[PDB]
Each structure stands twice: as C-alpha cells, then as structure tokens.
Symmetry: D2
Subunit: 293 residues, 4 copies
C-alpha cells in the first residue's frame, strides 16, 4: 500500500530498463485486448518500439518478422530478446539472452539454446493481467494492478505440483498421433492401476494452457507426429520461454528425445515438439515414449 512491491523493485534487487519497457508494452497490449490480425501487428510494433527504446537490446526476434531485427547502434544494449507479442490470436511470451559473441550483432546471437536464457516468462491477458517471470533464482508471479499501472508481486518462488490430475492437448488430431502419445493418453483415461482418471482441459491458446498447468499441475502436450515431425510450436519464442519457466518452477519440458532447453537451434523460426508440466507426469510420458523407441 505505502510500500508498493513492483516488478521494477523486485528486479532491481540494463535488464531493469529492458523489463520496464516490456511491462509498458504489456500494459498497452492488455488495454487493447480489453477494448476489442490487426492486433497482432500492432502488438508487435509496440513491443519492438518499446524494446528498442530501452537502450538494452541489440537483436530482436519476433514471430511476425522473417529475419531478426538488428537494433540501431545508438540504441543498442547487450541483450537479445525473442518474443511472441500476441500468442493465441491470449498472451505475450518472451525470452531474454545475453549476447555472447563479441562481433557485430547478427541473427546468430539469437541461436542460443534455452539453457542460456537470462530471463523468460509470459503475460496472460484475462480478467486480470498476470505476468510470470522466471530468472535464475526461480519463478515469480506479478499481477497488473490497473489502479496504479504497475505489476505487483503476488506469488514468490512458484513451484509446480509434483504430480497433476489434468492433461492438455488437442485430441481432435488423434488420427495423427504417434503411437507413444496415443498410449500415454489412453493411460490417463483408462488408468491400468485403477486410480482416478485425469480430467482433460484444452483452452487452445498456449499461454492459458501452460499457465493452468503451472498453477494446478498436470501436463501439456503439443507433440510431434509423422505429419508435423518437429511439432508446431516455435522453439525460440514459445517453447524455450515456457520450458525455462517450467524448469525453474521444478517442472520439466521435453521434446520427447531431449530437454527443450538443450535443443541447439539453426533457424530462428524452427518448430519443436513440447511436452511439459509436473515432473511425474512428464516422466510418465518419457517412459511411454522410450517404450516405443
């Protein structure tokens, strides 16, 4: 009340400037969402302009642009940012790297594995706007307080449930499942040990589904198959930030054959399968997966 605990204060304990400009873009997107393809492009412009104006970034990768944006040298800082400004048509997803090579900034500075992330998270636009921010120390949830236009810390050092009771994927594409996913889903509905079957939830928007997985536990799947052999979600600005949040909350995220965060990308827009969530549920999937390998 008299000691507002804002995201700025929490992070202050260049990166502060970066995240402040991002919060400004998230608040503006939140407002534009509340008063509603056009919104996609305007969200992108907002995030690009705010991140450039922070003096903290040198390379920006967006879902909207084929090539990385290289920041003008007068506005250039040391961070690389990959973002999805309006995921789900909703939310915003971001991942922040430190530039590693010492040469002139280029698309290659964004090709780091998620293990190299300095900070990642997402904003979920709903009745309230929530911002989940993962850093090395752990995961913290902030809520936009619309009265004062600040993100307030509301949940510190978030940890995901060890085991969940919800599974989340688009089962309408069952005809195309690889056998491992088919059997894993069968075990959730027909538990061979006579325990209670899992409930199914699928919002259809990654940020909402992932957020519910974090808060309530369970598993979220956007898996590969013979039709989409690398999955559908984008590694740099969807899978890697979500995998980083999950891992820092004590969860897991795998493509099925390796940790999402260990994939070394060659293309800023490459896709990745992803299965993430409560560690016991992801382990159970990886166990069914290996059986089919």
């Amino acid at each position: 009340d008299t000691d507002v605990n804002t995201l700025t204060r929490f992070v202050m304990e260049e990166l502060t400037q970066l995240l402040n400009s991002l919060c400004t873009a998230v608040k503006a997107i939140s407002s534009a969402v509340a008063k509603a393809k056009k919104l996609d492009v305007l969200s992108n412009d907002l995030v690009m302009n705010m991140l450039k104006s922070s003096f903290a970034t040198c390379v920006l990768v967006s879902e909207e642009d084929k090539h990385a944006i290289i920041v003008e040298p007068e506005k250039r800082g040391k961070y690389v940012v990959c973002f999805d400004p309006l995921d789900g048509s909703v939310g915003t997803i971001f991942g922040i790297y430190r530039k590693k090579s010492t040469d002139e900034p280029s698309e290659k500075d964004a090709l780091q594995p998620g293990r190299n992330l300095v900070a990642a998270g997402y904003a979920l636009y709903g009745s309230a706007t929530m911002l989940v921010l993962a850093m090395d120390c752990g995961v913290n949830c902030f809520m936009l307080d619309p009265a004062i236009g600040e993100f307030i810390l509301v949940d510190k050092d978030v940890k995901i449930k060890k085991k969940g009771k919800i599974y989340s994927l688009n089962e309408g594409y069952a005809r195309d499942f690889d056998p491992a996913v088919t059997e894993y889903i069968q075990r959730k509905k027909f538990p061979p040990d006579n325990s209670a079957p899992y409930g199914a939830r699928y919002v259809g928007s990654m940020v909402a589904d992932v957020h519910r997985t974090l808060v309530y536990g369970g598993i979220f799947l956007y898996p590969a198959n013979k039709k989409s052999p690398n999955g559908k979600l984008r590694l740099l600005y969807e899978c890697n930030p979500m995998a980083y949040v999950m891992e820092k909350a004590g969860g897991m995220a795998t493509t099925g054959k390796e940790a999402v965060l260990d994939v070394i990308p060659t293309d800023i827009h490459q896709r990745a399968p992803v299965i993430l969530g409560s560690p016991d549920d992801v382990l159970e999937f990886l166990k069914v997966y290996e059986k089919h390998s």
Copy 2:
C-alpha cells in the same frame, strides 16, 4: 448516442435486468481483483430483491428457494448461478402464494435468459422471445453496450467440446460420436477439440464459433452433472433463440419439467447439424 442494455430492453422486467447488470458489474470487478461465490450470491440476491420485480429466487448456493418479502415482491422468478468464470440466469413470470414450486417451470416458459462471461472484457448475452443480443461492458462508462444484434449460430461447426478425461465412463453413443469426430468416415477433415472446463466459456465459444458442447449422461451419472434450472435451461434458451439446438439426448432441455430445483440434466447443445448428427448416433446406441 449510447445504446445500452436498458434502452434495448425498454424498446417489471427492465428494473429486474438493471439490478442484475449492477450485480454483474460488481462481480466482474471482484473477479478482476482476485468465498468469492458466496459474495457473488449475496450480490445477486440483494440486487434482485431490491428491484421490486421478483418473488422467488433460486440459486446454486441455497438449498431452498428464497421467497421475497411482500414489501419488495414482484412478478418474476429468477434462477441463477452467480459464479459458474461467468454468471448464468433464467427469468420466468410467476403463475397463488409465491413458493418454491413457482420455479419448477419448463425452460419453454422462459421470458429471458443469458449469461455474463468475465474475461479481458465482460460480455453479456441476453436472449428473449425475439432473439439473442450481445452486450459488452464498457468500463469507462459502466454500461452494457449493444455490440452484436440478433446473433445466430453456424449451421455446422468444426469444434467438439467435452471432458474426454471421463471417456472410460462414457455412454457408447458418446464414444461413437467422438470417434466419428476424430476419424471421419466420409473422408472429411477431423474436428478440433476445445474444453475450457467452464460452462459459460465453452458455451460462449460454441455460440460464436459454432460446433457442439456435451455434458452427457452415462450410467454412473444418468442425469448428467449440470443443473437444469440455472445452468442447462438458460443455456438451452440462448442456443434455441440463436437457431441452434439443446437436447438431453431424449428430448429438448427446454421441455424437461423439473420436480426439484437442484435436479441435474444431460446437455448436448450447439450447431444444429452437429446436434442432429449426435442424435442420429444416439438413436442406434444407448
């Protein structure tokens, strides 16, 4: 200049809906800055009573019907779910001393029904005899504003919506229908699946995008799980007034005659082609 819900309704019932809108705005605010369903129940009850338009009030939260004190008594009976997130409501004219039996009317008797959905924006869908209209809460001025007139649902959709987690307990007809959605026999494209787990959100998506929503009966749950009076009937009335369908499997939800205010009903609703297709599967398999 400003096309509010009250103006639409005027062109007593207006006083009832005005009081309901006040409760809905208060709940919308409480949801945003979050026992919450107990607060929400009190809100809707207190405003409905203060409207001088109601006599019998049925809520998900109260075991018995609330009878309105005679000073504040009006003509209408209201069944509502204050925090289903969303708010659901159904409004009947009474027809004798007001009592719990006045709420035991088939949904066919509804005068008005609809729901509020609390998201990034707060939407209110209102169905009356002449159709369905959609209102958005403009928080700048605190009024529900007309944004979609005479809403009709698509004839056929591309989404099916149910908790597939319960598949082991499914009725074989539901099992068969869902199988045809994923593995279409006539070589058409499979349906997508969506299931939020919140009935207002799932029904609203069905109204807007088209498709089918199911919370059907099985042998563990022969009457389904949703409540007829303050969940199924209002949603069914909205669906029918938008050119869609709502069936229990055996009959139209709106034609069920309740005997208890908390009784459950199976519900299958949405686009008419899709509900008809389910009914076809339902005929041949139990």
Copy 3:
C-alpha cells in the same frame, strides 16, 4: 449489498429519468477525464439520454436557443433544464426537474419558478465524480464508483453549516459592484466586531464553488455587473437548481430582492444575480442589502 442512486430513488417516470441522466453523467465524466467540441458532445449525450428515458416532454439547455419538444412517442411528464458542461481544472453538470403542470408541451412548461422543482442537483467532475441530488426530503451525495459504474450513496441528508468562514466571488469586478456588495465584502476582511476575517476562495466554475460552499459553509456571490446588468448566471439551469440544493440543505439563496426560487421566469435563458450559502452569512448580506435600499 450496494446502495446505488437508482435504489435510493426507487425507495422514495422519475427513476428512469434519473437513470438515464446518470448514464450521461458517467459518459461526460469519461470524456472530461480523457480530454468547445466537448460542450456540444455533452449536450448531445444528455439530450439523447433524456429523450430515450420516455420520461420527459420539454428539454431546456444552455446549448439550444429554444426549448426542445420531445417527439410524441417518447414523451413523459417531466421537464428538464440543464447545463451539460458548466464551467467549460473544474467542470460539472447542473440539472433541474419539473412536472409539466396542461396542454401540448412547449417552451412555457419550462417557465416555472424554482419553488416548483421536483428534483435538482449537479455532478462535479474531479478526481472523483460526485453527484449531489436534492428532492423534497433533503440533499444526498453520491460518488461514482468507477469499478462498478454506479453512483453510490456516500452522504445522507446533507446540511450546510449555519455559519461559514469563506466568501466566494470574482472580486475583479469590484469597480462594478453596487454599494451593498462592496460593504458586505469589506465586512468580511475588516470585521467591525473584532472577529477573525474570512478567507476568500473562487475557483471560477459555479459547480465547484457551490459544492465547496455546501461542504464547508460560507457564502457564494455572483452579483450583477456592468457587462452583466441582470446578472451572469442562468436562472433556469444554474441558479434555480443550486438554490434548491441550498434550501434543501438548510441554506439560503437570494437575488437580493427575493428568493431565487420565487423568481417567476419569462425567458428560458434569462439571467439572475445570486447570493447563496450558509444562512447566517446570507442573512448578514441581506441586512446590508436592506440598509442600502
């Protein structure tokens, strides 16, 4: 349980009229916050809202040369005189409501003395939007709660202080004041009874100055001057509503010769001098006025 203006009115057609007026005030409040053109915007809002209420037949506004006659299908039994954006920081809305007292509605129905008022009040657009409503039984204050978009009862049966310590007028017109005003003002600064001089306040917007007078006591004057020899403020939709609020709060409102509320108007835009506020202060002014006539 929420104590709204519409609930208060119902427990005491007038309710639809006041409901429609509240919607216009809420909309004006928002346009003021996010701001000539606003004058006619606000007039349109009030005109359209009152017409759609089905409760009015004759509408008089500052912005319209002649009285508006409501189309027969939307007609009701009430006459409304209003200033939609008085003072156009500090602005407000002023309204007075009469019952039509014959034949076909026309301008003459608006020409009743303020004594005949059924309801009157004002909205003050500040950091909070306040609505003060006067009816037969007294004055009540409502605050707009923006979280829920309703006017909430905040002060019941408001009574003005018997004697205040603030006087309020534009002393820039000192050269044009008649001798009673000059002597009265001089008594406020140099009290012949060794009491403490009054403070002076003058915002220059009638609603703000009158609301301060109501809440803190004192006296407000807008006498005639050389360029405004019949007074400056408009009798029908400025002085009469404020005079009715004052009298219903136990205060007074005079032209000098007689009660504002007893003036019988001849023209819908005619002006009046006005002295209003705490009864001891207005009585002291009247004693000076009588001495000079």
Copy 4:
C-alpha cells in the same frame, strides 16, 4: 499508440531516470488514493518509500517531517529530493531534485542549495485527469497520466507562459494584513489607471492548481510578505523553489519582491519565502509598485 511517448522515454532522451520512474509510481498511487477517498501521511510514506527504493537518492526533505531523512548507505545515490507529497490537503504533489554537492556524509545541509541549482522540478495535479509538469535544464514539458496503460504520456513540449495575463490570484481575505504595495497592486488590477479592462480574480486555495492555471492561461500568483509574516507563508524548498524553477523555465518570473526566489540561499529546510510569480509583464508591474514602497 504503437510508439508510446512516455515520461521514462523522454527522460532517457541513468540514476535520474530511476528516480523519476519511482516518483511516477508514487504519483500514480497517490492519484488513485485521492480518487477513492490521513491521506497526507499515506502520500508521504509512498513518496519516501519509492524514492528510497530507487537507489538514486541520499537526502529526502518532506513537508511532513521536521527533519531530513538520510537514505541508508545500501540504497544511497547522488540526488537530494525536496517534496510536498499532498499539497492542498484540488490537490497536488510538488518536488525539487538537486545533485549532492559535497564529499561529506549526506546530511540536512545537502538540501540547503539555492533553487538555481535544481536539476529537475515540477508537480503533479490530481484532477479528472492527472497531469505531471516537469521542468529541467532544457525547458518545461507536460505529461498526462494515461490510466488505460498507467503511464505518463507527453502532451505538450517546451511550455511557455503568456507574456501578460488577465487574472490575478491571491487570498484577499487577508487584506487587513497586506503590505501597502500589495494593497496598491491589487487595487490597480480592479481599477486600472490606463482604462484597460480590469483583471479577473481566481483563487482555488491549492498552490498546485493556482500555479498550473497561471502557467496555462497567464497572469499572476501572489503569496507575499507582510508585517506579520516577513518571509511569506509558503515554504522555499518544496513549494516556492520548484514552482519558481518551473516558471523561469517557461519564460515567467518568480520573485520574493527583493530577489529571485531561485537565488535565495536557505539556512533551514522548512524556512518560508514570499513568492510572486507568473507572466513577466505582470510580475514586473508588481515589482514596480513594490519598489515604490
């Protein structure tokens, strides 16, 4: 809308940015609390806590606290802030920012600089819209709080005051105590020697509102010395100096009657100073009369 021009981005063109960012947070929180209404002690605590957390300040002087606050060494930065957290309790917040001049341990004496040494100064005015006026070496800029996104947005660049206004502003209730020069100056406003139009009078009674009107419409604002108060009534460090700085950067004047407010060398953090400020032609006419006495 996609290139939001925030106070932050204007100031970035970074300890001063951090300081001003943290001040903006307190101003937004105060703005909301005023709208939803011990407010001055709450406001004071909010400003102190935000300024402390900024890591940019070392000495804080508040209108509310007898003694200066010395910032703990771990949160210490180079700036000295004098502020009036809720002036008028129409209300506003006033601030003046200095750079510490000294290698000595931070103390009350670091706040005893002439206003000529200010790095930044200004005020927030809470109303229907919340405005922030910021004066820096290069001039005066006005920002409007956009409540949709919780950011101060640049709405008017390089503000200049009118050369001559038509409004004078002071509390004429104190007339019995006026120094003869103020008496004569005010008389000339009402009875102009040259047969020009008399000035209008406005006096809200809140310094931020009265000064802001003076800035926007021109004219003159006076809280002068007299025999009872030889040093005026308003406070030099956190009222007179910030307003004098704003005025001079806008092309106006601000005098005690004997010298520029900004050139007074303070000896006490709470000392008073007379202040006469506003349009240059009007202040010069005041100084003509004051010299005469």
